[model samples]
Target chain A: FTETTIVVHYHRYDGKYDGWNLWIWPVEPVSQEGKAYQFTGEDDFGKVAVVKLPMDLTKVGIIVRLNEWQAKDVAKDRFIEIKDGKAEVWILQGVEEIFYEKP
Target chain B: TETTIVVHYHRYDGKYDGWNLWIWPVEPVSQEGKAYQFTGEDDFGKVAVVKLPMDLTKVGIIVRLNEWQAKDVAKDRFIEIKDGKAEVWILQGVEEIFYEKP
Candidate 1:
């Protein structure tokens, strides 16, 4: 590929999680071999993907498909959106311990 | 196994060292067999799951994908990783929208 076109956004963490955070990309990542990632290993963390398209999928063939690629807990109504030449993404995170505040 | 749903969000800053962040709801309790209970305070993964009960659930939760104080992720303009799961850092603190999913 020459002069690749790229876009970005993030999936907001709905709750605190203690593992790899899910980061959904607007375009489906093409492997160096030029293939899509497959969820094969049962031990692999399930990932959630958000593929946005320039045009409707009906007009365009699979403009983008955001499939679950990691094993993180994904709640309903939680996802990023693409609009006006931009895609927004959200994801979860692990919490760190809090230290006592000193006056 | 009972289906357990986890929720959270993540964002990356285009730094030399990768930076990621997230937050999840306290627990998965059904309400009237519809709509699981959730709150802003549920943002804390540990507290929400371990120490959530009663009206105390009304408090609310929120968390940030903030910086790494110990390892301190520095800022960068353009950097990207293209591998099994590729990622391109567009800005210093944000990620470009396409990456290798494998």
Candidate 2:
């Protein structure tokens, strides 16, 4: 596959999860987990964390959490498909499902 | 949005390394549900994710290997995936699944 990138929008009430980091990884073919990148940007919905993933990776698992792995915003991991070399994940605080829009 | 379910199977002893997640219709639980390879994980650990079409809502699950030759005796455990996405956590020797870890 072509080179890939991911744009994640993590929505929390008034930036409740400030200083939290984003953990991401490629799920298909069972590759290694990526680093926990901190958010340095903002989006209309909330904070933004973006990363250029390793090429050829298809599906991705994401967790917006505190510190490196101190705690996850949610309990279980949320995953999304990589379509057209891009994966967009919209995560809301305390929600079980990942949304396609701001919630 | 599409419907998806993620299962995080935690076994303190890495037993079923190459095992898979078997998912089927809600009846027994889905569209001739098939087994998905238990792929990579987050920092939290062992997870399998499956993207289900709109045709499905919830399904039965069994953590198994060898094409269902060896299986979780606590078979037909289930999880529900509504319009968006859902996840369940299963620990070894446990019959009940938690929406999150307990």
Candidate 3:
């Protein structure tokens, strides 16, 4: 359970995305085609997306996109740090900081 | 003048009974939150419907069984009213709520 997976919690800048999508791909020993996830729940910041990788991995590439990438948080790939085989990342648009806890 | 919310539920075993919509903070602040009794069969399987003032905007919801004896899920849920209507779906064992059918 430690340092083998990645967790990302994210929200849009406006805090009003109802059915948002999150896409993630790992860039480590190998890269998969990536996976798309829907909002599992909502919080003070907004929606939440979590990924528990099947294979052991330290880090992964991420994108907060909707409408099949018609819109995205950023065009460039965002990275999440994995510590001890686990990653808990929180991202809020316009905040300029990715937190390990709710932000 | 009113907001309509239609909830479609899918149970793994195909039993569609005893589930209702429990709404809270009905807002305008004066109105008390209430549980709406509704569960019926439709082409979409089991369904529940609730209608309230558009001004209320959003409220907490729970897919409960027989007045809080059991809940469909462990976490809280929210329904937002846009253009006076919202359509929602809750499938048993799935945590994600869908605005449109998958």
Candidate 4:
């Protein structure tokens, strides 16, 4: 329910590795007031992370992705669950480029 | 086009991971075995056909568009168009379409 918007930053094949990279921004990107969380794991299959917060903080039902090959497993896992005025951002295991945008 | 086969699909929860899907064609069910047989499931459990007056393999690809964020979205033509004809169309956030069989 907060006025702040959330953004997910995704990078594919950063020229160093062979998998996808993801980051989350809880605050606006215009300034350095907030920090962004980057996903970390060594497995090639990928990793999943969940962001729990108030349901009002996100759109709650949007699927954000960079391409068809990425986020398939994460999306199948009900990445976002909104209930009881709370929200959960489910990041599933896979490799691709994407960033979630909430207005 | 000779016959018309329309596939309507929706991803689970706005995600392009899995799908709840359906298909209809002006052609009869009797043709399912002849022209509608699938090659088997892919990484996404989708099937593809090489040719048909109403092929559907490309349609399967369009259904999975949400797996990645759309670079561009048009109210009418949602998927990117490469061919002169609108063979595949996607309306991310709503639904997807294969306007014609290639």
Candidate 5:
């Protein structure tokens, strides 16, 4: 039960065949509150702006369909998993420290 | 005394006549033997670890000499700095070890 607004962002690769869908789950059960819709797009494609739920959401997953947006369900595949409201990012290198070395 | 990490330093062929090669003692320092190994030169040799020095962070290296000249090189002389994970030259003369976890 955390109290804060969380947003998740990710890049969806499209040149290939992949299924896309967004899922939403909360730490606990809650009812809907409000909803709003906005739209933004590039020369090739536009994305539907923020979707407000009727109630506060804790966890959410999003899926973007490739090639076509008018496609129906059934063929939708899961490319990412959003467990909590925030998405997970992987890191390999350790944190870099500033040191004076003769260049 | 577990693992000995060597910091090998060297001067390039087309270098000044008096420049010296050097290395830094990084983690697990038991100061046993030379830990640098040089390649392709009769003038320079490789140095290696004497004892297994393990469990430290990074090592520091510095090189200084006069009248040093390197031949067939774009710069004065070529200086090579070597560590266990990576290697480069001590052109500016200050290299640090990055000890991190995976």
Candidate 6:
């Protein structure tokens, strides 16, 4: 199996602060060699830093997160003020089964 | 288990308008039904409560109140729970017809 690079995009009410409040992760992350999956970058977006995955499953799970300040208040209050607060996720790979995935 | 219903309240800048911002538990007992009773104060010292027999999801209740009173109840959070079995939210000034079963 080849490596896959997943790209996630999020849109808030505005562009006031740096896009460092939103966090995304795989619900059950596992490495290509069946080891613990590890990656770098925790702010908003980055690479998964994994090799591959088992060929038995059809797809994987992706979950979004917000920091203490972001989740408790910013997201609950400020984020809701945006005209269209939305998040878009996509993956860069040659696989055909990774289409029409939604949140 | 006796079916317990939970009610949730919410407010949006521009969401659902046809709804009033008040607590209306479904299946409330009659005026004489001791199992169902309302315990609430005015907007100055507000506290609204009720007992129901059916889930809000099954039947809708209309708890009419003054605009001032509606805003007071939803000052904290838009989401409120009754008995964890049913979820309901109150809308204020929202006119759109969009629908989402939460």
Per-prediction TM-score, chain B alone: 0.19, 0.81, 0.81, 0.24, 0.32, 0.29
Model 6 ranges with Cα > 4 A deviation: A1-22, A25-59, A66-103, B1-102
User: Chain B TM-score of model 1, please?
Assistant: 0.19
* lDDT (Cα, tens digit) per residue for candidate 3, span A29-78: 66778888777766554566566677767667777787687777665787
Error of 3 at B18 (Å): 1.0
User: 1 or 5: which has the higher lDDT?
Assistant: 5
Model 4 whole-model lDDT (C-alpha atoms): 0.30
For candidate 5, give the DockQ.
Answer: 0.14
Q: Candidate 4 lDDT, tens digit per residue, B1-100? A: 3333323322222333433222222212222222232343423323433234542222222232333244223232232223212233222332234443
Candidate 2 chain A: minimum summed lDDT over ten consecutive residues — where?
Answer: A94-103
Regions more than 4 Å wrong, model 5: A1-103, B1-13, B16-18, B26-55, B66-84, B92-102
Each model's iRMS = 13.3, 14.9, 14.7, 11.5, 18.2, 16.2
Q: Pick the candidate with the highest lDDT.
A: 2
- Which lDDT value does model 4 have at B85? 22
* Index of the highest-DockQ prediction: 5
User: Candidate 5 lDDT, tens digit per residue, A1-103?
Assistant: 2432323222222212243222333333453322222222221211222333433444433333322355423233222223333333211111122111112
TM (chain A) per model: 0.24, 0.84, 0.79, 0.25, 0.28, 0.30
Off by over 4 Å in 4: A1-19, A27-46, A51-86, A90-103, B1-22, B26-35, B40-45, B50-102
CAPRI-wise, candidate 6 is incorrect
Q: Which candidate would rank higher by TM-score, 2 or 3?
A: 3
lDDT of 5 by residue, B1-102 (tens): 233343233322234334443344444452332323333332222233322344434444334453224312223222222343433322122233222220
For all candidates, state DockQ relative to the true structure. Answer: 0.09, 0.02, 0.02, 0.05, 0.14, 0.02
| Residue B61 accuracy (lDDT) in model 1 | 21
* Highest-TM-score candidate: 3
Sliding window of 10 residues with minimal summed lDDT for model 6 chain B: B93-102
CA lDDT, candidate 4, residue A5: 31
Reference-based TM-score, model 1: 0.21
User: What tens digits encode model 1's per-residue C-alpha lDDT throughout A1-103?
Assistant: 2122122222223322224333322332321211232211121122333343333211111111234334433333132232343332222222111111100
